[PDB]
Amino acid sequence: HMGTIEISSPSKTHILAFPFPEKGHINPMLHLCNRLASKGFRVTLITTISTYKDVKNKIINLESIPDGTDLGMNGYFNQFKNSVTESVAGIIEEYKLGHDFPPPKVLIYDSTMPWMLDVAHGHGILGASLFTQPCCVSVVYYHMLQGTIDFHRSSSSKVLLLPCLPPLEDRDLPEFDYFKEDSGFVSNLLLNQFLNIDKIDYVLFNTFEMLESEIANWMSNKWKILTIGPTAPTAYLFETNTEVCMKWLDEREPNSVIYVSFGSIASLTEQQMEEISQALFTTNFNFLWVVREEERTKLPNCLSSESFTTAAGKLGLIINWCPQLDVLRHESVACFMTHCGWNSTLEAISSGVPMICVPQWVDQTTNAKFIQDVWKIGVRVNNNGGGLVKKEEIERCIKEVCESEKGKELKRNAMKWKDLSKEAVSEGGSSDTNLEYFASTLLF
């Protein structure tokens, strides 16, 4: 007969998001923010000023913070941690005292920044840790943290058996020694994702349960992890060179283009670029090869963008960046020569594109193991077993993926996993359900 009703809805719930300022961490966070804004949430993405321009063009409320850094990996990272700890706390407190927006309910922060949980909890809001790597390699990091099995790795070969994982050869383990005297720092960075795993309010993984069933269930029983991937949309984020790349691809034959990208960070030696060049300029396919501006000088002196007719009569384009998700979904693309970063790997899965795996370090070695031997949607190159990958090896892997009956089955496998990733994020799918569990319980 008389009183007041209070309605908690997405439209009056405010979600803060803070990615690590690198594209493989920014991009999956942005995709997740877009899905959350689509459910009606007020979403504020926080990012460093030197990434603010990039994020501004791709896209949601946007907020910049100082880069926090002036310097090797450690000094860079400790300054970073100290600076963003204060600036994000300031943003949280300002949005508490505001009146236009709702006060923040939760901070979604990158899993490699676990101290951000103390920032969120210290300011009275929930924390959600977004893991940007698959379940299988993340569990390895946990076991390395637990200091149980010896992971130290030339007088023998070792094979490691961990619960709910296929046996892992030494080459299958996440690769840190590439970083030499910084291997400890990079190692610590990935291991420490688990330092406070039991105190995190939501543990988010950009993967889908059918892809990693055994290990996801294992993790789900230990922690209440929510697999919510792929966060990228199925068949928004507007990448640079979009019109140029789509026009070039629209003029190619179906299933005729090898797409080549080594991600946003990896840098191959100039001898390694030469092997890749000679392979691509003599194969029976067109090619689209992303060579970042800062990497152009490692190209063979033989050669913003550049067009080629190849020695096989085909066409090549070398470009400094591309809308990778749109490239992968283009009918012209036959396969994806990739460094096996997790976003690249999962984007290719969601697109049905088989892979040639040229992994460089951290999780890319483990991902390539799963791409070839578990999901069976690619072939991994063979290095002296850090070793150079020769043009004849790359050529062997192209002919296998694109010119053999085995390649036809890898393509069938990849269309099967493509359908499964689409079902995961559709209504009733495992990832849609876990993302809704996140959204719905935020309202409680």
Ligand X SMILES: O=c1ccn([C@@H]2O[C@H](COP(=O)(O)OP(=O)(O)O[C@H]3O[C@H](CO)[C@@H](O)[C@H](O)[C@H]3O)[C@@H](O)[C@H]2O)c(=O)[nH]1
Annotated binding site for UDP-alpha-D-glucose: 25, 27, 132, 264, 321-322, 324, 342-344, 347, 363-364
Which amino acids are annotated as binding site for UDP, given as ranges? 27, 239, 264, 322, 324, 339, 343-344, 347
Which of 218/262 has CB closer to ligand X?
262
- To the nearest whole angstrom, how small is the minimum distance from the Cβ of residue 2 to ligand X? 54
Structural tokens at position 224: 């209440």
- Structural contact between residues 34 and 17, judged by C-beta atoms closer than 8 angstroms: no
Q: CB neighbours (10 Å) of residue 247?
A: 9
The three-class DSSP label of residue 351 is coil
The three-class DSSP label of residue 287 is strand
- To the nearest whole angstrom, how small is the minimum distance from the Cβ of residue 132 to ligand X? 4
Eight-state DSSP code of residue 314: -
Distances in Å between the Cα of 402 and the Cα atoms of 70, 279, 280, 355, 418 are 47, 14, 13, 10, 18
Cis peptide before 323 (omega within 30 of 0): no
Q: Which helix (H) or strand (E) holds 110?
A: strand 104-110
- To the nearest whole angstrom, how small is the minimum distance from the Cβ of residue 443 to ligand X? 29
- To the nearest whole angstrom, how small is the minimum distance from the Cβ of residue 265 to ligand X? 4
Which of 289/438 has CB closer to ligand X?
289
Which of 263/352 has CB closer to ligand X?
263
Which of 175/275 has CB closer to ligand X?
175
- Structural contact between residues 108 and 204, judged by C-beta atoms closer than 8 angstroms: yes
> Which residue carries 């963003």 as its tokens?
84
Eight-state DSSP code of residue 175: B
Which of 58/412 has CB closer to ligand X?
58
Breaks (C-N over 2.5 A) in the chain follow: 59, 70, 153, 235, 303, 383, 385
- Structural contact between residues 433 and 424, judged by C-beta atoms closer than 8 angstroms: no
Give residues in contact with ligand X (CB under 6 A): 22-25, 27, 132-133, 239, 261, 263-266, 290, 321-322, 324-325, 341-344, 347, 362-364
Beta-bridge partner residues of 130: 110, 204
E strands, 159-219, where?
A: 159-160, 168-169, 202-205
* Length of the chain counted residue by residue: 444
Q: Sheet containing 126-131: which strands, arranged edge to edge? A: 61-65, 42-48, 14-18, 104-110, 126-131, 202-205, 225-227
Q: By beta-carbon distance, which residue lies closest to ligand X?
A: 24
Q: Which amino acid is at 66?
A: P
- To the nearest whole angstrom, how small is the minimum distance from the Cβ of residue 350 to ligand X? 11
Which of 91/260 has CB closer to ligand X?
260
- Structural contact between residues 309 and 334, judged by C-beta atoms closer than 8 angstroms: no
Which of 92/225 has CB closer to ligand X?
225
- Give the Cα separation of 69 and 151 in Å (integer): 33
Eight-state DSSP code of residue 362: B
Which of 95/375 has CB closer to ligand X?
375
Structural tokens at position 388: 């150079």
The residues near 137 (Cβ < 8 Å, ≥ 6 apart) are 174, 342, 363, 366, 367
Which of 151/178 has CB closer to ligand X?
178
